[PDB]
Design a protein around this ligand. Structure first.
Ligand SMILES: [Ag+]
Ligand SMILES: [Ag+]
Ligand SMILES: [Ag+]
Ligand SMILES: [Ag+]
Ligand SMILES: [Ag+]
Ligand SMILES: [Ag+]
Ligand SMILES: [Ag+]
Ligand SMILES: [Ag+]
Ligand SMILES: [Ag+]
Ligand SMILES: [Ag+]
Lengths: 65, 65
C-alpha cells in the first residue's frame, strides 16, 4: 500500500504527530490519517519497516495492513 | 471546501512544509497536498483567511478555490 493500523492514534492530535513523524523521515511522502479508523496510508520510497520503526520510536507502534 | 492553489508549492518538500504549517496551526486539521496540481485541501474549524494568513507567512501564498 502501504497502510498501517495504529491503535494509539486515538485523536486528531495523535494523527498530527504521526503525520509529522513520517514527513520528517521522508519530506516527499504522502500520508493520509483517519481518526475514525486509526488507519494511516503512506506513499513513500522507504520500506514499511522503516516507516514502522519510526512510528514505534515516536510511541505509535503500528500493525502493517 | 476548503481548497487552495499554491503556486510556490513546486515539490514534495514544499508540500511537506505546507502540511506541517497547517497542522501546527490546528492539530485536528486534515490536509491533502498534490504536487502535480499544487492544490491543498483542508478540513478545519479555522477560517480560510486564517489558514491563508499562515500559509502566506510561511512563504506559500495561496489562492482560495
Ligand atoms: Ag490523541
Ligand atoms: Ag487526544
Ligand atoms: Ag497524542
Ligand atoms: Ag494525545
Ligand atoms: Ag501528506
Ligand atoms: Ag519544493
Ligand atoms: Ag524542491
Ligand atoms: Ag520548499
Ligand atoms: Ag524547496
Ligand atoms: Ag493531514
Amino acid at each position: 500500500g502501504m497502510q498501517f493500523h495504529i491503535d494509539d492514534m486515538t485523536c486528531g492530535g495523535c494523527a498530527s504527530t504521526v503525520k509529522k513523524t513520517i514527513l520528517t523521515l521522508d519530506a516527499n511522502a504522502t500520508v493520509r490519517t483517519d481518526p475514525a479508523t486509526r488507519l494511516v496510508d503512506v506513499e513513500t520510497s522507504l520500506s514499511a519497516e522503516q516507516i514502522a520503526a519510526a512510528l514505534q520510536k515516536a510511541g505509535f507502534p503500528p500493525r502493517e495492513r
